[model samples]
Target: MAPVQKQFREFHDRIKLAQYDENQTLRDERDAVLTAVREGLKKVFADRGEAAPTFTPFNQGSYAMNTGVKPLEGGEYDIDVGIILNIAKDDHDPVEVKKWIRDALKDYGNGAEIRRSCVTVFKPGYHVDLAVYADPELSGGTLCIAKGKENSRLWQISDPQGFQDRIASKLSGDDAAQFRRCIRYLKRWRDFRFSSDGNAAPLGIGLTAAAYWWFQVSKRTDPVSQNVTYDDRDALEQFVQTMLDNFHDTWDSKDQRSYPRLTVELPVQPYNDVFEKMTGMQMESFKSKLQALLNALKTAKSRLELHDACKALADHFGSEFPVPEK
Candidate 1:
């Protein structure tokens, strides 16, 4: 009703990632890395005189789901490539298997490093994060992944594909797009409000997984004009409020203290808490920042002038959120 929809949609276009399909260069660059890794892994096993295991690669994370926000300047794209191995999780230790991915891509890329969950292949300002998962065909229907650092590696049940499907299940119709756009909005909010280089803030997956549970679609049709308008401002404020409402106090045995913690499960097999990396102090900061944003949103929405409202919003979302003249 306040005409925020025009500015909000404009903001969305500015922040959303340029689709890979729309650009040949982007597609070629991504496909080449994918192709090299597929072939590289084959050569790695063959050179060692071992039968090469089939690695099924598919797009994962924000790219696959169409919920990505463009990276800030001086930052590169982090593409998620899910590599499901035909072998069972029991065949080898988690780190050892994950290491093979790094080994395969190391020669082709500038650097390939193994992390707790995936192997990151860096190059062309387009880094590919290869997440290794054991085949669901071998481990019943539950897809499991290799996790942890080298010495601490182990097989853990995970379902990246299933998680995507689960999120999609909630978005079943024409009104579905708002749920995705809402996720992108909060992600940008995270970037604006939190430190970019550290774990001081919650993971992007945390915001994403949480939204799947609590985000609401806000739309209204004008009876006189037969027009529809969306309210992302109200939707996000309510969504943040709901997330804060759902947090419960969790005990930290080592610290012998209790802190309010919000829990969001994977929405798939294993169903682990999505915010496991977030600490108690981190959760508190998350709570406080969210509360601050909630108050900001309320104050912004209450403004009678569009320019004033947008100026308030720009304070939180940075300068790309346009503030128009009256």
Candidate 2:
């Protein structure tokens, strides 16, 4: 492997999720809360005693994919647990379904908040997001997620399994490991750059999906050996460049006076636009940060000495990224 590649790998390993026991402890707590919520829901349905929905809980998002990262100091990590209900849409409106979940957990007093798409239970150490989904069998063979307010409920097509399968199918062995490392690196960069500001940063899913796309499209063969290779430095640089180039192209294609909205669409059934909630100012801020990160990576790559490269990386990724010993 190349020197820079080796250094980049070291940096990722140093900052990636390494506290196994802490993570397990958090998981245990989350599972316990989810179990209570599940039992509560079952009781609620049983008490209703007429056309009550059956609940099936499953994991989703970063935790399920092993791509989760510990938050920076003063931040809390979140785990997503989806509840799939085996009931037809005719039985209850999406709004009603969400309310049912909320009502069941009302007594937990865990400070649960019902958001646009998920019911969030905020605890001391971490938070759990309970996303409600309708079983495919009830929705004409398509998975539908309950979203929006009680007054304006909506059924949105979704396929979390498909999204997971897509990423899993594209990667295995060393490739999978590298993909995960790159994701953690990018996520760390986001936290370092934007966590201080109250503005919205790029979503973790958006960053992960973009990296996956870059991995698929970018050339990965070792130029000299003509063999498949995984180079963290090259992969990281290329992903940032691809994102910057994409933003520039999109910005230029539209009216010059107005900035174009940046969006990274999820590559699954619902095809949710990850940046759908991002404001124009937030989008511009994200673009600016990406440019800065690209420049930092370029500077790191240009340096001949490992010490200089390490410094450049630390400048972009914060103190957690280990700097090499002189």
Candidate 3:
């Protein structure tokens, strides 16, 4: 067996996205977007002469979970802001609420497009996605989000807060550190292995949820050096193994063949299988690629030397995974 924990930890450091403390510029950009939305909403509501309260924005998604990674080559960094306005989902049309957001940032032209789920405003090198919610602090009923276009707008059941909490709960007390690091490895692998954007590739949130359920925290201490190292290779390999173990065989009626299917339910309101967007063929591809990654990780773990082990990992994880002197 091999011990390349040193290289694996270094790889983790190389791919992980730093937070506000180290990335003040990123915070500035994020704050500008949030401020734009907040100020724009205030003006929009003020002009309407209505009772709508000012929209409050907060962080969500991978950034909030500490699981986000550096984007792949030619990719821009992204962060999601949850916009909560204290109001009833039934009080107004969902799309109208979303439109309020769209019109708020209408100055950005193409950057402020109102997509089905949220209003995404883009900026160079990074972007902010605003997911607007109906109520601010409702605890009785399931939370609802504004969804669909103006013509087809409606309130949709959602609990992004619960989803965030679910992922955070998996981190426990101390495993929190390694837990997200392992997920970052999985995320970087996803970006490296799949095409830039498509249903064929698993969503970052998909990988996040999967790791929440399957990832095992792996760490080791050198007997001589007394350095504590996170065993990301074993964690990722075992996580993939367990993920594949959960896939069930299914026969396709139309394709006239069989494939493996995996269903991961959202841990909140309107819970639906997160992988439902992926087709059976796509899931099959996902399964096969994961198996490939699992094999690569195992092979890396079996190599006796650091350079050899790192070479095996770098083949699949891209050049960010550094190999030692040959």
Candidate 4:
């Protein structure tokens, strides 16, 4: 094991969500907002003399996966809450349901906005994205989400539970712990590298699924040594290498010079391609940054000094990653 292995692990541990109240504050705020939305919606329906729609809210993103990281300085974290309503699809239009949610949360007074697929309520430290879903029986006997589009609306098939379960099913015991830590490390890297330009950055779930895929493909071997332990340095180095190799292989196969869009498919029903939102320019930019980081990791790995390695990592991972003592 390298000397910086322990330091890298320590740095990752510091930046991960473990130091906080395990997101208790964020969770509480999300729950409060959801409750407010639910109560407010009930009143809206009651005022209209219509029976209130019953709904259930549950977490669905990084918060639920335990891979959530603390927000960077002046950055707000997001919590994804799924709102499943027990209502007949034929009775209410998808757009109408979204409108009801928007109207109900309009007075949330916390920067509430009706986004394409959810009612987003923004607070000081975090934001809640309430995604509305109708009864599965209403949409081809599968769960569907109410999505608001420009001048139109649709109910898109989505299975948040299936997405979560697929990722969770991939790991067990120690692998699960390490896999989540790797995800946080990659997320931290994304935040650091793309903090200024989020539009061109890869989505968090994209990085997460990519990392999980890497973990699945990479072989882990342990030699009999009590002093040696698996560490982030090795794992991260291999992760970068795998990403680089994948990109190179794809690019080499393409005859055209145009950059190819990187697709990270959700391993669940619908199997939506998460990277489909990224444009060619964005993919090119991401590839360039990934190559730069790969070179930095190579240089860090070449040097035996801990300061050199930590400095390289800090340059890419930002100040959240601890610098070595001189």
lDDT (Cα atoms) of all candidates against the true structure = 0.80, 0.75, 0.79, 0.75
Better-scoring candidate (TM-score), 2 or 3: 3
lDDT of 3 at 7: 80
- Model number with the top lDDT: 1
Put down candidate 4 lDDT per residue, 180-246, tens digits, no spaces.
Answer: 8778877888888987789988888898878767763323465555443556666667887787666
Task: Identify the runs in model 1 with alpha carbons over 4 angstroms from their true place.
Answer: 19-26, 224-226, 251-257
Clashing pairs in 1: none
User: Candidate 3: lDDT of 133?
Assistant: 85
Candidate 3 at 256: error in angstroms? 3.3
User: What lDDT tens digits, residue by residue, belong to model 3 across residues 135-221?
Assistant: 745523656778897545677788787888988887676578778877788788888888644558888887877887777887677
Q: Report the C-alpha lDDT of model 1 over 239-283, residue by residue, as the tens digit.
A: 989998998888889999998888888777787888877888888
TM-score head-to-head 1 vs 4, winner? 1
TM-score of 4: 0.89
Q: Write the per-residue lDDT of candidate 2 for residues 136-166, one digit (tens) a residue.
A: 7877887788888754568888888778787
RMSD (Cα, Å) of candidate 4?
3.2
Best by TM-score: 1
TM-scores of the models, in the order given = 0.91, 0.87, 0.89, 0.89
Residue 5 Cα positional deviation in candidate 3, in Å, after optimal superposition: 0.4
Which ranges in model 3 have alpha carbons more than 4 Å from their true place?
Answer: 20-22, 42-47, 136-141, 150-153, 220-229
Give the 10-residue window scoring lowest on summed lDDT in candidate 1. 18-27
Cα distance off (Å), candidate 4, residue 43: 3.0
